[PDB]
């Protein structure tokens, strides 16, 4: 398809896409005239938009006299660009903070998913007295030092006692044997099982964030950003969107009618080689591609180096 | 006592007996000989039973005609009457219906004590939601299903998270440590507040039934009613009645003189050859030992029954 | 004034209304209540409820919907209603600050089960920075790899960050050197850069990036179930969370103890689609801050207020009891 285009006529495609995704209304060939370095009256820019227009790149919606790149617009867009170019031990806070930037930073919707805890092993248990009105408890893993809840205590307890069992019960154990009721020992102990029920609880696959920037983007509707919190449930839709390396989906590339207004960027991130979990950010179609791919690898290297660090 | 008495003279005793149990009043000679197939005159009878009262046998209430049995009477009539010869899963509901069948058909007054809930531990708790309107609640101990409530719900939960919260904090407990205020995570808030009551609510030691049989039959004053429920609140009273199996205490045999009015059926129920309880089958000492006796056996077999079953 | 019957009525139509978000005619209301009279005597209440302002026609539909004053109408009885028998609700007596020492997971968790049962938005107000004065800092080394950092408040401990060392300094004496920098200010003094020490050295700028993290006033929850309500649209939620960041509004909303603003009742037509419960959060006599639930006027509200008073009550024990 893009054989069939001279240098001229990708100028002009590159800033019909380029001037659609700062102000987002349709370009016509006066508009490129204006913002534009081509050496070109305004009657070939109107032949080049036509041919443009003809080979499925830009597209004319309702009466309007500029046209809108399609989705084969932006794929080429984001191709062009792609050519020219602290200390925190705790796992669940370095995904938060990536979350919240990534999301931030590119007015999208960020999905990471946590690590599987069905491997992890607790390597270490601490009840910490700090006075004697509070304590603070976390395990150690591989990952860092995870679960941490302050505790408020009524009654002075044997916290060293306390700590010992938690040890004996939980040291080599996973947090996933937790989850499921494989820790039987039946022996009793009050304060022990308050902090297996901690260790046990719960957790989403993944940490969500920046929903609300969906909600301000003016190319997307209610129905749209339902459509993307249902599909989101589809846990083998989300598993196939992570081909590769780095990866964008670009409207009806991602291959769900539903979701054609969106973009999806995914990726993973690392300890060593071994995949530790998927990052998704969504965002309109309509969306600053350079600056969204830039700061999703940055994330994505973020991820990996505090992840392999921790070994 | 033995060599004692004659063939003749232990029917003669045997009918003062059986005659006593049935009107309840003194029996005469000329009695003896009216519900007896006896082939000598009352005169004889008479000097029969001046050698039974001799002994101990048979005593004369007031100034009347005719004689009672002492309790060695009673006592060796039981003797001879010796030589002569539904899928439910809640422990609670089949205590329940044991005592009241026992009770209805000996026209006795019946304790059975619970399975003892120092040892009585929670090996599940169930939550489980029947409509949008009603969950069950429930724990399984060794011995089946128990605390079986239905509860009312509002706004709709994750309950499955909820069991699980219950399950960490309250699996490998006791019931008594419940009952005892020793979880202190229950008064953690209202909704665990509940479930200590619903698993610490207020209950006896023993099973009670039949009161209102020892108010029906006329051998038994005010006063010896109060007697025996003030007697039964003594917990190594009640420890001491149960001998080897089956065991009845008549009258004096009690060892308690306020009680002397009474006896007293005991035996346990096992679960294989582990005795998990006692049972007492309280009546006047004018009672109908064999069909008491056959009665309290057939209970206690069914009982034991049940709960090997539960294994 | 209404009679009692024509309360009644109004007050079927309304909850109805609420239920499945229809047009009530006078042929529903006789349906689904044990209302006696006839179906004529009906159309008739309702020509006089309308009259009174109490209820609309949409265009042409023999149904009609609840205005405003309708919607506090009904509200005013339910409340009524609600004083003669318990509560009773399963699912927000699970609420438990349970043994949690941490602030911030109890108003996260707080926040949180509130727009879960109520289906809205919920923001709490976190305690103010300004005077909340730092009590004692702690650095605990829990190996050679690891060190826990917290600050101890009024209302707990805070800010508990684990941190990596892959070298080791002296941490008994720098948590001396933080104490007597630190404790006796408070944090909005330190989020305002008056403790100029904390610069002097590196781990010293690490913790005051800590303490001085970036935290929003309020914490929010619930931003999913405005947008699966059918009453919404993206205009309506658009224009919440532009309002919600005007604090002198927020603040005008809240009056003596627990009450709630129905459409109209709000203060910008703007958001005129919603109803807002709002209340503050105590330590003893003292107001630490404030909690609103925005949902849809079109919601259950007899629901909404019992869990709102619940968790609200829950927080002022929370945050009295760390007294």
Same mark, same amino acid.
């Given at each position: 398809a893009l054989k069939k285009l001279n240098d001229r006529q990708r100028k002009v495609l590159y800033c019909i896409v380029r001037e659609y995704i700062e102000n987002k209304k349709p370009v016509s060939s006066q508009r490129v005239l204006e913002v534009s370095n081509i050496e070109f009256s305004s009657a070939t820019i109107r032949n080049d938009m036509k041919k443009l227009e003809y080979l499925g790149y830009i597209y004319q919606p309702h009466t309007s006299a500029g046209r809108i790149p399609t989705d084969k617009g932006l794929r080429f867009y984001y191709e062009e660009m792609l050519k020219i170019s602290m200390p925190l031990a705790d796992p *669940?806070?370095? +995904?938060?903070?990536?979350?919240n930037l990534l999301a931030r930073l590119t007015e999208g919707y960020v999905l990471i998913e946590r690590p599987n805890t069905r491997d992890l092993k607790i390597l270490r248990v601490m009840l910490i007295p700090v006075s004697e009105d509070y304590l603070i408890f976390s395990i150690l893993t591989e990952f860092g030092v995870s679960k941490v809840t302050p505790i408020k205590t009524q009654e002075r307890l044997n916290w060293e006692e306390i700590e010992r069992q938690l040890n004996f019960l939980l040291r080599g154990r996973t947090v996933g044997e937790?989850?499921?009721?494989?820790?039987?020992?039946?022996?009793?102990?009050?304060?022990?099982?308050?902090?297996?029920?901690?260790?046990?609880?719960?957790? *989403?696959?993944? +940490?969500?964030?920046?929903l609300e920037n969906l909600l301000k983007d003016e190319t997307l509707t209610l129905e749209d950003i339902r459509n993307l919190l249902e599909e989101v449930k589809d846990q083998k839709f989300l598993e196939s969107l992570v081909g590769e390396g780095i990866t964008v989906r670009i409207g009806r590339e991602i291959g769900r009618k539903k979701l054609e207004k969106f973009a999806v960027f995914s990726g993973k991130y690392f300890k060593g080689e071994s995949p530790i979990g998927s990052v998704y950010l969504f965002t309109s179609k309509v969306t600053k591609y350079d600056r969204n791919h830039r700061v999703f690898e940055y994330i994505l290297n973020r991820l990996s180096e505090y992840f392999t660090s921790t070994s």
């Open positions: *669940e806070k370095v +995904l938060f903070l990536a979350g937790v989850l499921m009721g494989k820790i039987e020992s039946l022996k009793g102990s009050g304060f022990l099982r308050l902090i297996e029920s901690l260790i046990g609880e719960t957790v *989403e696959r993944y +940490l969500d964030a920046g």
